[PDB]
């Protein structure tokens, strides 16, 4: 049983013929609500999907989760060669072509694909990420929801290079099994923007889950 998150070891990653470039269609993706869950920040969506790459069908977008740590240099779930990023976004997707809902897809072997976009604290103010950062005033208390009163295009939070690692693991809560698509190239944000998440209430200083052992029989693939 291979749990997530893991430390991806680059020397152990292997090739596969099906890892073409991943086509990401978020042109028709809009956000709906945004939540403080007591542990982390969730942003729900309606519309958008991913295709191409190694996927047989398309998987539609569900939600976005955001993770962070106590300090700026060390806050991601996943690691690459024992190196952590400042934070991590998890875009959840599910197989609508085969199955009738998200909670239905959570029970199947091939139900879920989670994309991982890393955050790195530089001195650039991310104009697209700010529109999420602004909404955090609504959801200060634990277990609160608010509507996303802001125009937002999800495409603009994609990294500049979409080379990727991919492995089978789980969801972060160990609810279900899921395929991961992890982009090593992080998007750049300011410390101000990330430190605003740390003012949320349960003070939520950090919410990353510690890594599990990469098993000897688990394969990690490079694109």
């Amino acid at each position, epitope marked *: *049983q*291979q749990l997530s998150p893991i430390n991806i070891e680059t020397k152990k990653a292997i090739s*596969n*013929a*099906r890892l073409k470039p991943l086509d990401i269609h978020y042109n028709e993706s809009k956000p709906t609500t945004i939540q403080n869950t007591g542990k982390l920040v969730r942003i729900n969506f309606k519309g958008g999907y991913i295709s191409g790459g*190694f*996927l*047989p069908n398309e998987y539609v977008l569900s939600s976005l989760h955001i993770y962070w740590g106590k300090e700026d240099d060390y806050g991601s779930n996943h690691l690459i060669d024992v190196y952590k990023y400042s934070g991590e976004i998890n875009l959840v997707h599910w197989n609508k072509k085969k199955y009738s809902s998200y909670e239905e897809a959570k*029970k*199947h*072997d*091939d139900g879920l694909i989670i994309i991982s976009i890393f955050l790195q604290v530089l001195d650039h103010k991310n104009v697209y990420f700010q529109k999420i950062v602004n909404q955090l005033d609504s959801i200060r208390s634990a277990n609160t929801s608010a509507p996303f009163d802001s125009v937002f295009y999800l495409d603009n939070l994609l990294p500049s290079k979409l080379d990727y690692f*991919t492995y*089978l*693991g*789980t969801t972060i809560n160990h609810s279900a*099994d899921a*395929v991961w698509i992890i982009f090593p190239t992080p998007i750049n944000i300011h410390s101000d923007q990330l430190s605003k998440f740390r003012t949320l209430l349960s003070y939520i200083t950090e919410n990353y889950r510690n890594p599990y052992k990469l*098993n000897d*029989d*688990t*394969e990690v*693939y490079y694109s």
Partner: antibody
Amino acid sequence: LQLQESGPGLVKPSETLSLTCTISGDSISSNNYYWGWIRQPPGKGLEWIGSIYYSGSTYYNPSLKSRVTISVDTSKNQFSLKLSSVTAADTAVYYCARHRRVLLWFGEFQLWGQGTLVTVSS
Amino acid sequence: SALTQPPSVSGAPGQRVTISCTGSSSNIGAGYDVHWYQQLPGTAPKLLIYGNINRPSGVPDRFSGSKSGTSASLAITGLQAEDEADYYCQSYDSSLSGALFGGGTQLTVLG
């Protein structure tokens, strides 16, 4: 790790063939693998019947989809085949085997059982 | 959704024998890998090649795998008498949504 089929040699025609594979030396509840049944009629080729994930999900051969059922029992480290409405074409050696999950499809059949002969006859 | 193999091949001991596995755009040509198995009479299939080219521990160096386009090939370089067996290519097929075996090739060692 070992796989071990268990089940009757003989089943009467138009009735349900029933087999059970028992895994030992390792756990069946692992998300890296599927658990498959394969058959070989005497002097003929291998045919994949179907496969099952630890948590329940099934994938069957579309030739035999309507007659085939597979199930798992993670508490007893075993999985089962039931094949209904059986004719002389279903007389075969039946193999249980562990194969690899590769992302969103299947890889190789790494370990196989001995095989058990089931004969269709009145 | 079919993998074609020639029904029989033969060679003398120490010769190079190849066995082809012709597939389609729904299996080999879609990048799903090809795996090979050896079967001695009355025993279970045994994994010989996986991921087009890889050998498990125990399989000797003379066994070899390749793939290009819609076709894949098992080569045996230096036939031994113990290599008399049935050989099966195997892959995944997207329209089947599951595993797919070829018809098999009976290998006879002459001489």
